[PDB]
Enzyme design. Structure first.
Site, PDB file in Angstrom:
ATOM      1  N   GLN A  18     -16.397  13.914 -17.349  1.00  6.26           N
ATOM      2  CA  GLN A  18     -16.952  14.127 -18.387  1.00  6.26           C
ATOM      3  C   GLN A  18     -16.036  15.417 -18.870  1.00  6.26           C
ATOM      4  OE1 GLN A  18     -19.208  13.184 -20.523  1.00  6.26           O
ATOM      5  NE2 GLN A  18     -19.303  15.238 -21.853  1.00  6.26           N
ATOM      6  N   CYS A  19     -15.327  14.988 -19.787  1.00  2.07           N
ATOM      7  CA  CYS A  19     -14.163  16.020 -20.245  1.00  2.07           C
ATOM      8  C   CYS A  19     -14.424  16.929 -21.349  1.00  2.07           C
ATOM      9  CB  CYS A  19     -12.762  15.285 -20.836  1.00  2.07           C
ATOM     10  SG  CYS A  19     -11.907  14.713 -19.199  1.00  2.07           S
ATOM     11  N   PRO A  74     -24.831  13.874 -17.128  1.00  7.21           N
ATOM     12  CA  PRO A  74     -25.541  15.194 -17.357  1.00  7.21           C
ATOM     13  C   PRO A  74     -25.757  15.251 -19.097  1.00  7.21           C
ATOM     14  CG  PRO A  74     -23.036  15.475 -17.357  1.00  7.21           C
ATOM     15  CD  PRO A  74     -23.321  14.106 -16.640  1.00  7.21           C
ATOM     16  N   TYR A  75     -25.253  13.973 -20.009  1.00 10.68           N
ATOM     17  CA  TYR A  75     -25.580  13.878 -21.153  1.00 10.68           C
ATOM     18  C   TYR A  75     -26.529  12.433 -21.495  1.00 10.68           C
ATOM     19  CZ  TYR A  75     -22.935  18.246 -21.645  1.00 10.68           C
ATOM     20  OH  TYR A  75     -22.252  19.342 -21.317  1.00 10.68           O
ATOM     21  N   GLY A  85     -25.320  10.510 -24.104  1.00 14.79           N
ATOM     22  CA  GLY A  85     -24.326   9.748 -24.078  1.00 14.79           C
ATOM     23  C   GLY A  85     -22.941  10.394 -24.319  1.00 14.79           C
ATOM     24  N   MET A  86     -21.857   9.756 -24.301  1.00 18.62           N
ATOM     25  CA  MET A  86     -20.401  10.461 -24.596  1.00 18.62           C
ATOM     26  C   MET A  86     -19.596   9.386 -25.088  1.00 18.62           C
ATOM     27  SD  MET A  86     -18.687  12.912 -24.542  1.00 18.62           S
ATOM     28  CE  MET A  86     -17.158  13.006 -25.442  1.00 18.62           C
ATOM     29  N   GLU A  87     -19.301   9.366 -26.420  1.00 20.79           N
ATOM     30  CA  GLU A  87     -18.450   8.877 -27.130  1.00 20.79           C
ATOM     31  C   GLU A  87     -17.246   8.571 -26.794  1.00 20.79           C
ATOM     32  OE1 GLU A  87     -19.658  11.746 -27.986  1.00 20.79           O
ATOM     33  OE2 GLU A  87     -18.124  12.927 -29.302  1.00 20.79           O
ATOM     34  N   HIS A 119     -25.920   6.910 -32.292  1.00 21.07           N
ATOM     35  CA  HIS A 119     -25.437   8.259 -32.436  1.00 21.07           C
ATOM     36  C   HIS A 119     -23.714   7.846 -31.861  1.00 21.07           C
ATOM     37  CE1 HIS A 119     -25.147  12.564 -32.355  1.00 21.07           C
ATOM     38  NE2 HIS A 119     -24.374  12.491 -31.552  1.00 21.07           N
ATOM     39  N   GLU A 120     -23.816   7.338 -30.648  1.00 14.93           N
ATOM     40  CA  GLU A 120     -22.480   7.164 -29.973  1.00 14.93           C
ATOM     41  C   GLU A 120     -21.582   6.286 -30.724  1.00 14.93           C
ATOM     42  OE1 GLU A 120     -22.162   9.646 -27.763  1.00 14.93           O
ATOM     43  OE2 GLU A 120     -24.383   9.906 -27.433  1.00 14.93           O
ATOM     44  N   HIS A 127     -20.089   8.186 -33.752  1.00 13.97           N
ATOM     45  CA  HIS A 127     -18.850   9.039 -33.482  1.00 13.97           C
ATOM     46  C   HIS A 127     -17.445   8.316 -33.263  1.00 13.97           C
ATOM     47  CE1 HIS A 127     -20.119  12.838 -32.157  1.00 13.97           C
ATOM     48  NE2 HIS A 127     -21.048  12.438 -31.371  1.00 13.97           N
ATOM     49  N   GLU A 134     -20.987  16.931 -34.610  1.00 15.61           N
ATOM     50  CA  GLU A 134     -22.394  16.434 -34.348  1.00 15.61           C
ATOM     51  C   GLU A 134     -23.114  16.273 -35.729  1.00 15.61           C
ATOM     52  OE1 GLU A 134     -22.867  15.003 -31.958  1.00 15.61           O
ATOM     53  OE2 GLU A 134     -21.030  15.787 -30.530  1.00 15.61           O
ATOM     54  N   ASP A 194     -19.897  25.146 -22.268  1.00 10.83           N
ATOM     55  CA  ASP A 194     -21.056  24.500 -21.617  1.00 10.83           C
ATOM     56  C   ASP A 194     -22.253  25.271 -22.016  1.00 10.83           C
ATOM     57  OD1 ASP A 194     -19.442  22.342 -21.180  1.00 10.83           O
ATOM     58  OD2 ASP A 194     -19.154  22.730 -18.852  1.00 10.83           O
ATOM     59  N   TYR A 236     -26.210  19.985 -34.000  1.00 13.03           N
ATOM     60  CA  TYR A 236     -26.553  18.661 -34.311  1.00 13.03           C
ATOM     61  C   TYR A 236     -27.618  18.854 -35.300  1.00 13.03           C
ATOM     62  CZ  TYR A 236     -25.101  16.785 -29.590  1.00 13.03           C
ATOM     63  OH  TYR A 236     -24.394  16.410 -28.658  1.00 13.03           O
TER      64      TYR A 236
HETATM   65  N1  LIG Z   1     -20.553  14.493 -27.218  1.00 15.92           N
HETATM   66  C1  LIG Z   1     -21.923  13.717 -26.603  1.00 15.92           C
HETATM   67  C2  LIG Z   1     -22.851  13.579 -27.933  1.00 15.92           C
HETATM   68  O1  LIG Z   1     -22.405  12.126 -28.336  1.00 15.92           O
HETATM   69  C3  LIG Z   1     -22.720  15.001 -25.691  1.00 15.92           C
HETATM   70  N2  LIG Z   1     -21.748  15.777 -24.942  1.00 15.92           N
HETATM   71  N3  LIG Z   1     -21.063  15.715 -24.038  1.00 15.92           N
HETATM   72  N4  LIG Z   1     -20.290  16.815 -23.640  1.00 15.92           N
HETATM   73  C4  LIG Z   1     -20.494  17.671 -24.826  1.00 15.92           C
HETATM   74  C5  LIG Z   1     -20.316  18.993 -25.225  1.00 15.92           C
HETATM   75  C6  LIG Z   1     -20.252  19.436 -26.487  1.00 15.92           C
HETATM   76  C7  LIG Z   1     -20.092  20.620 -26.815  1.00 15.92           C
HETATM   77  C8  LIG Z   1     -19.688  21.522 -25.738  1.00 15.92           C
HETATM   78  O2  LIG Z   1     -19.471  22.884 -26.272  1.00 15.92           O
HETATM   79  C9  LIG Z   1     -20.058  23.262 -27.478  1.00 15.92           C
HETATM   80  N5  LIG Z   1     -21.203  23.450 -27.716  1.00 15.92           N
HETATM   81  C10 LIG Z   1     -21.727  23.899 -29.098  1.00 15.92           C
HETATM   82  C11 LIG Z   1     -20.767  24.511 -29.809  1.00 15.92           C
HETATM   83 CL1  LIG Z   1     -21.430  25.059 -31.321  1.00 15.92          CL
HETATM   84  C12 LIG Z   1     -19.519  24.442 -29.668  1.00 15.92           C
HETATM   85  C13 LIG Z   1     -18.900  23.863 -28.304  1.00 15.92           C
HETATM   86  F1  LIG Z   1     -17.739  23.912 -28.030  1.00 15.92           F
HETATM   87  C14 LIG Z   1     -20.144  21.411 -24.362  1.00 15.92           C
HETATM   88  C15 LIG Z   1     -20.248  19.942 -24.283  1.00 15.92           C
HETATM   89  N6  LIG Z   1     -21.650  17.005 -25.489  1.00 15.92           N
HETATM   90 ZN   LIG Z   2     -22.760  13.529 -30.409  1.00 12.35          ZN
END
Ligand SMILES: N[C@H](CO)Cn1nnc(-c2ccc(Oc3ncc(Cl)cc3F)cc2)n1
Ligand SMILES: [Zn+2]
Ligand SMILES: [Yb+3]
Ligand SMILES: [Yb+3]
Ligand SMILES: [Yb+3]
EC number: 3.3.2.6
Length: 607
Positions: A131-132, A263-264, A266-268, A292-293, A296, A315, A372, A380
């Site tokens: 999960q990058c 942890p989420y 989904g991840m696209e 949603h995915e 993306h 988002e 994080d 979103y």
């Molecule tokens: N993208 C997937 C949905 O499809 C789910 N998802 N998985 N990982 C993450 C992820 C996204 C952003 C993040 O940091 C930030 N948060 C909020 C802001 Cl305003 C800026 C940021 F940098 C940390 C984690 N989101």
């Molecule tokens: Zn998303």
């Protein structure tokens, strides 16, 4: 300027390609190999460059077949350590070189979760997943860990022969490992330039089932059948998403149903969306996460935010497209129901953070902030509310969808800021600039709290949820016997979820009301993760001790942060369960996903 990265910016040098050759060692919990980066200088006389790393052990750096000098700087908390490499010969502008870095990951890499056989469905083999997003690629490999740089990639992954490797790329064959007959090398190719946060890897006892002309569903054997039914609407959604955003350019659209600790929702990951198994409701009711995915693939993966301060671009546009796909399949009344629900989730986040909190701003400043910790529904939903307000202001969905498609075409394969988006919106809507100039941009983009304007929502599907919620909130003890299972007979699962969301906004309710709700509605029997989460939060916030084991089990048997974090926080805020919540976190911490363990620890104030 990307304040989350310590690497040389795109104005100095750009990574064009990554050729990854690695081996997954489950006994040491390490990923060992070489990351060969094709880097293009953007400056004259370039003699050095800096890459992001986090808990990586560097063995050596080879350029032109010879080892070069490099130095790791002091660790900068969550940003990791900068890695400066001295180039053997000065590069001219646009000159490309290949830098091969021999590295190894730490077992405590924040990008990875190593699972023992006991933590899997099958119980015989271990499992690994990455999960990058946002800035965890540097904890897998040395890179310019910023979404402002897009690169293609190839990979060769050596894993024990009984296991399967998958990546966010097209599968490019498999062979026995020539250095070890007990292993297999899986090959991958990603021909579309991507930001490095989209690099993904899963290694496990995976099986696949085809569910559409360009989709396989992957999971452990025990979840294949349920997942294939759950996600059967994937191809229909891809076809609608193509109508809205233009051609799907990634070739394949596969889905991977991860173990419960993902942890989420989904991840696209390009070519291979990762999803939580908590979507397996049995009735396709949580399929908006797939929509949603899928979305993306245009907003985020094609048009990417240049820095994490502009994450709302990824988002907000994705939620806007997701809701259009669900509106195409189930009607405009349903798109309005989901949009109004999203506004309610935005109310919750703004209440939780506070109306003046910097994370309630649309465009954020992540200088010295771990992305994080900043993560929430604000980008979103405040992002969606902005686009939905502009849709109504500019002439309706059909007109705003025309802008959306032109926006995607305009910025495909690029990384952009809020100013790039705003400039294109004013250019596309040149004949409506007088209307656009009525928008309070400073408040919408840079001010905290709820937006200055709330869009107009159709209430048809929401009315029954509000009415039943208000019946329960205004009921006294002598009204409790009027409630009956027939109250929910004309409610969809979505409407039941919205009823609980509306009620949870006014929690706590009296304990007797909550007990009566279980008596007549039997919400304890519902397996749907969204409904069960809200009902359990409602029970804990209303001080029902009976709900403590149910909420502890849900918080630990799965690890989707959307559910686990508020469940642990509710359990910590209830005096009767406070000690159990802290003890349960302490005993599960080592077996949790590293990011989830960190955030639950911060939420619980447990070090
Ligand atoms: N993208 C997937 C949905 O499809 C789910 N998802 N998985 N990982 C993450 C992820 C996204 C952003 C993040 O940091 C930030 N948060 C909020 C802001 Cl305003 C800026 C940021 F940098 C940390 C984690 N989101
Ligand atoms: Zn998303
Ligand atoms: Yb091939
Ligand atoms: Yb302009
Ligand atoms: Yb009464």
């Amino acid at each position: 300027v990307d304040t989350c990265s310590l690497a040389s910016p795109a104005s100095v040098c750009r990574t064009k390609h990554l050729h990854l050759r690695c081996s997954v060692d489950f006994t040491r919990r390490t990923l060992t190999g070489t990351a060969a980066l094709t880097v293009q200088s953007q400056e004259d006389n370039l003699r050095s460059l800096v890459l992001d790393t986090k808990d990586l052990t560097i063995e050596k750096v080879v350029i032109n077949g010879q080892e070069v000098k490099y130095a790791l700087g002091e660790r900068q908390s969550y940003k990791g350590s900068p890695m400066e490499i001295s180039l053997p010969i000065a590069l001219s502008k646009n000159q490309e070189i290949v830098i091969e870095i021999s590295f190894e990951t730490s077992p405590k890499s924040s990008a990875l979760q190593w699972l023992t056989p006991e933590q899997t469905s099958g119980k015989e083999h271990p499992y690994l997943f990455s999960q990058c997003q946002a800035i965890h690629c540097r904890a897998i490999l040395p890179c310019q860990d910023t979404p402002s740089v897009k690169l293609t990639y190839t990979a060769e992954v050596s894993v024990p022969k009984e296991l399967v490797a998958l990546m966010s790329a097209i599968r490019d064959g498999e062979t026995p490992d020539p250095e070890d007959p007990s292993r297999k090398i899986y090959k991958f190719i990603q021909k579309v330039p991507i930001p490095c946060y989209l690099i993904a890897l899963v290694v496990g006892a995976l099986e696949s089932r085809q569910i559409g002309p360009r989709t396989l569903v992957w999971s452990e054997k025990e979840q294949v059948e349920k997942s294939a039914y759950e996600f059967s609407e994937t191809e229909s959604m891809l076809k609608i998403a193509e109508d809205l955003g233009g051609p799907y350019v990634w070739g394949q659209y596969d889905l991977l149903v991860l173990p419960p600790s993902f942890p989420y929702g989904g991840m696209e990951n390009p070519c291979l969306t990762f999803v939580t198994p908590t979507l397996l409701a049995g009735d396709k009711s949580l399929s908006n996460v797939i929509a949603h995915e899928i979305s993306h693939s245009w907003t985020g993966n094609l048009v990417t935010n240049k820095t994490w301060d502009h994450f709302w671009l990824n988002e907000g546009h994705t939620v806007y497209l997701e809701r259009h796909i669900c509106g195409r399949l189930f009607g405009e009344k349903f798109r309005h129901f989901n949009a109004l629900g999203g506004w309610g989730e935005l109310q919750n986040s703004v209440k939780t953070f506070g109306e003046t909190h910097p994370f309630t701003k649309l465009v954020v400043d992540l200088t010295d902030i771990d992305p994080d910790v900043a993560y929430s529904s604000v980008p979103y939903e405040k992002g969606f509310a902005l686009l939905f307000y502009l849709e109504q202001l500019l002439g309706g969905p059909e007109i705003f969808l025309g802008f959306l498609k032109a926006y995607v075409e305009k910025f495909s394969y690029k990384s952009i800021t809020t100013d790039d988006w705003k400039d294109f919106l004013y250019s596309y809507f040149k004949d409506k600039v007088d209307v656009l100039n009525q928008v309070d941009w400073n408040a919408w983009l840079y001010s905290p709290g709820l937006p200055p304007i709330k869009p107009n929502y159709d209430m048809t599907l929401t009315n029954a949820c509000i009415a039943l919620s208000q019946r329960w909130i205004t009921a006294k003890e002598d009204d409790l016997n009027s409630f009956n299972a027939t109250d929910l007979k004309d409610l969809s699962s979505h409407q039941l979820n919205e009823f609980l969301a509306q009620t949870l906004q006014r929690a706590p309710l009296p304990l007797g009301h909550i007990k009566r709700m279980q008596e007549v509605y039997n919400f304890n029997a519902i397996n749907n993760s969204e409904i069960r989460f809200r009902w359990l939060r409602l029970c804990i916030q209303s001080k029902w001790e009976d709900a403590i084991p149910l909420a502890l089990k849900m918080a630990t048997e799965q690890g989707r942060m959307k559910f686990t974090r508020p469940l642990f926080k509710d359990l910590a805020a209830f005096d009767k369960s406070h000690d159990q919540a802290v003890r349960t976190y302490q005993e599960h911490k080592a077996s949790m996903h590293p990011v989830t363990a960190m955030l639950v620890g911060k939420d619980l104030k447990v070090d």
